[PDB]
Amino acid sequence: STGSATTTPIDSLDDAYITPVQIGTPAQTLNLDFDTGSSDLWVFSSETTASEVDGQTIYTPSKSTTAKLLSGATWSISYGDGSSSSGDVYTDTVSVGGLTVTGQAVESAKKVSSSFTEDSTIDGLLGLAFSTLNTVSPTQQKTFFDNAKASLDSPVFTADLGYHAPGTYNFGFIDTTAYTGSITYTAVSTKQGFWEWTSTGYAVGSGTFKSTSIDGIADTGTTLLYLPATVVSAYWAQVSGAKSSSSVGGYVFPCSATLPSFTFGVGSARIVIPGDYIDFGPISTGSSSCFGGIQSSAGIGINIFGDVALKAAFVVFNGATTPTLGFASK
Ligand SMILES: NCc1ccc(C(F)(F)F)cc1
């Protein structure tokens, strides 16, 4: 089997991407943030605290004839940005672009944090990291990809995120028309439950490529590109007037600047992020200082190849018995 669904930025800055997902019988369609950095499929629901719902579409399990309460199961998740949610668990039928899993664990939110309430466009998350990170207790549950894998034509899914435009998540096949050149595959460590890999280096604009190993995760659920402080300083030093702002919480730059590109290595291959992808717009409405799309990972503990990096590439999440990651230009 295969599945294919269009993913759309939630706003004019590509802060996140939403993909429609069918849940239950009859179908309830919710727009979920597909997150290769986490492993819980959770949704705003009829059970979510009323004051914490502000325009999201809710899943109502009592209206789904295939929904079954997973007895005694609860979940609670905290993300690296400080956001969180928690609730109880149903199993139900879940479909993405024609690909169907019966008995998928659907985590129904009873509580969500302020950042979720304030994003009216995100009805929940669909985790695509490794199932070892799933938070359901006392019986851990599998991701949608993990459940579908054996039925897929190939045990893979691909992320083709757009810059200021729609893109595609495919399950079970590689669309060879969706990229240029070849896909370079690189090793993955699953030891922390992430799609963790090692970039072979970087360049800033037309500068000399620096060969250096950068361990990090491929994370569609994170907006920006978080890299070591030395790398990030080298990038922003090329932008006249850019500086690290402690009040703002990262590097900012004059909105009048044209940004240099940033290149990252995948084996001997190179992925070029156009400079415009690195502009995240005014720090506050009407300001002429703009927030940078490449930020230091120093306070995080891990480097994150978030959407800024991934949307420059066609990305293969290969769930073969030894998982690997593939990157192609596009
Ligand atoms: N990395 C997962 C994630 C995704 C979205 C959000 C937000 F911004 F919608 F709350 C937070 C955390």
Residue numbers in the entry: 1 to 330
Task: Quote what the paper states about this structure.
A surprising fragment-binding discrepancy was observed between the cryo-cooled and physiological temperature structures, and multiple binding poses and their interplay with DMSO were captured. In addition, we found different binding modes for TL00150 between the S1 and S1′ positions in the EP structure that varied as a function of temperature and DMSO concentration. In comparison the 100 K structures only show a single stabilized protein state, which could have been introduced by the cryo-cooling procedure. However, at cryogenic temperatures protein plasticity can be limited due in part to the higher energy barrier that needs to be crossed to allow fragment binding when compared with room temperature. The difference in I/σ(I) and resolution range between the cryogenic and RT data in the highest resolution shell can be attributed to the use of different doses.
In this study, we used the aspartic protease endothiapepsin (EP), which serves as a model system for other aspartic proteases that play critical roles in several important diseases such as hypertension (renin), Alzheimer’s disease (β-secretase), malaria (plasmepsin IX/X) and HIV (HIV protease). EP has frequently been used to develop principles and fragment screening. Many fragment-based and inhibitor studies have found diverse ligand-binding modes in EP and, of these, ligand binding close to the catalytic centre of EP has been extensively studied. TL00150 binds to the active-site cleft of EP, in which 240 ligands were seen to bind.
